[PDB]
Amino acid sequence: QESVKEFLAKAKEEFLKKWESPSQNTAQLDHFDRIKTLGTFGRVMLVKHKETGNHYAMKILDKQKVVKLKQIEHTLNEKRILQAVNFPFLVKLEFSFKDNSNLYMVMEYVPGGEMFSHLRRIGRFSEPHARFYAAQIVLTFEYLHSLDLIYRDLKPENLLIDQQGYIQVTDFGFAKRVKGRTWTLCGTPEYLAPEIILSKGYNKAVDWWALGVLIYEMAAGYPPFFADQPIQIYEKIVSGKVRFPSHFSSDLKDLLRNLLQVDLTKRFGNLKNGVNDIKNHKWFATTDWIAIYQRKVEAPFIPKFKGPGDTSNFDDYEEEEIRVSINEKCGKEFTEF
Amino acid sequence: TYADFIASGRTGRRNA
Ligand SMILES: c1ccc2cnccc2c1
């Protein structure tokens, strides 16, 4: 308890220091060469710093589209959080800046690809392999929640696999500092907790629900609630019924029934013992939490890539201009970025 | 179950 307590207290101290005085305008666009679009309010591009030669993933957001999609506060949230957190399984923000048209967040490039692609290629992960990844998310959420941060977009698409086979969580677009509840409708349909769908004020229990969805999808190859159209998914989510493939262990089913509890007041991670109801569950009996945190556990696989500039594990997107207008757009809205 | 997931079509990257 004291080892963890003092760790988290220091982690919060250091977060709050950066949080109170965010960094701003720490590079500019022409410091980088554009290489390739890695994903698509904006997109993520692989770039190369012209002086150091280091590769980064540059998230580019169109200010005007951010305004129209009502994402102003969310983009400010994302940048402020990324520049203030520090944890082994969180993508590292190196620079941020803005110009007349766009907002830029420049992160260390993780060349191994998204867990999503690997999971669809292999079909499903074994339970040990799912558990290895799950354990990192548990520790990451323990860290974030102790900072009064909610994440709100857990899914394999946002979990990058790094050079050692470990996770780096990316995309903090929906993350937010919350000491009580919050109300915004956001997330991804298959991963939305019932109380989000039902337009309630909700809290960090939604991250533990999403972990339930993630573990199920990793171990089954399919998420627990799916349908042709999102509206049909939502009805399944709120129904309170989930079926498990027969190959799931009894321990896994028991953990998932407790994470995928529709009643947020009964959901693991949100009970009196918090995250320890999850960490102490039989399904994690073999998990060495410290060895995971120290990255001393052999990973299920090391992604195949040729070097720090290799884009092989990402797919191919239409290569569009980075348009920068001659006139400043939305200056007042993003003064603080 | 897994075949029904494939049948949904929603096996690609999911947007927010
Ligand atoms: C989206 C897609 C690829 C990425 C690769 N490395 C870091 C962040 C990223 C975000």
Q: Are A99 and A58 in contact (CB under 8 A)?
A: no
Rounded distance from Cα A58 to ligand 1 centre (Å): 8
Q: Are A173 and A75 in contact (CB under 8 A)?
A: yes
Rounded distance from Cα A153 to ligand 1 centre (Å): 15
* Ligand 1 atom at shortest distance from the alpha carbon of A110: 6
- Which pair of structure tokens corresponds to residue A278? 């999850």
- Residues A265, A195: Cα–Cα separation, whole Å: 11
Dihedral sign computed on CA atoms, order A55, A59, A63, A65: positive
A254 tagged catalytic: no
DSSP state, B9? S
With b for 16 or more beta-carbon neighbours within 10 A and e for fewer, the A79-100 pattern comes to: bbbbbbbebbbbbebbbbbbbe
B3 to chain A nearest CA, in Å? 9
Give ∠ CA A220-A243-A255 in degrees, rounded to 5: 70
Structure obtained using = X-ray
Rounded distance from Cα A115 to ligand 1 centre (Å): 11
- Residue A98 makes CB contacts below 8 A (sequence gap 6+) with A25, A63, A104, A334, A337
Return the number of other C-beta atoms located less than 10 Å from residue A303's C-beta.
20
Are β-strands A32-39 and A42-49 bridged in parallel, bridged antiparallel, or unpaired? Answer: antiparallel
The backbone torsions φ and ψ at residue A214, rounded to the nearest 5 degrees and listed phi first, read -60, -50
3-state SS track over chain A? CHHHHHHHHHHHHHHHHHHHCCCCCCCCHHHEEEEEEEECCEEEEEEEECCCCCEEEEEEEEHHHHHHCCCHHHHHHHHHHHCCCCCCCECCEEEEEECCCEEEEEEECCCCCEHHHHHHHHCCCCHHHHHHHHHHHHHHHHHHHHCCEECCCCCHHHEEECCCCCEEECCCCCCEECCCCECCCCCCHHHCCHHHHCCCCECCHHHHHHHHHHHHHHHHCCCCCCCCCHHHHHHHHHHCCCCCCCCCCHHHHHHHHHHCCCCHHHCCCCCCCCCHHHHCCHHHCCCCHHHHHCCCCCCCCCCCCCCCCCCCCCCCCCCCCCCCCCCCCCCCCCCCC
A186 to chain B nearest CA, in Å? 7
- Residue A200 makes CB contacts below 8 A (sequence gap 6+) with none
Which of B2, B4, B10, B11 is most worth mutating to test chain A (most A CB atoms within 10 A of its CB)?
Answer: B10
- Which amino acid belongs to residue A159? L
Map out the domains of chain A as residue ranges.
Answer: 1-21+114-304, 22-113+305-337
CA dihedral A134, A138, A140, A146 (to 10 degrees): 170
Of the candidates A153, A171, A207, A277, the residue annotated as catalytic is A153
- Which pair of structure tokens corresponds to residue A255? 């953990």
Q: Are A301 and A275 in contact (CB under 8 A)?
A: no
Q: How many inter-chain contacts (A to B, CB under 8 Å) are there?
A: 41
A56 known member of a binding site = no
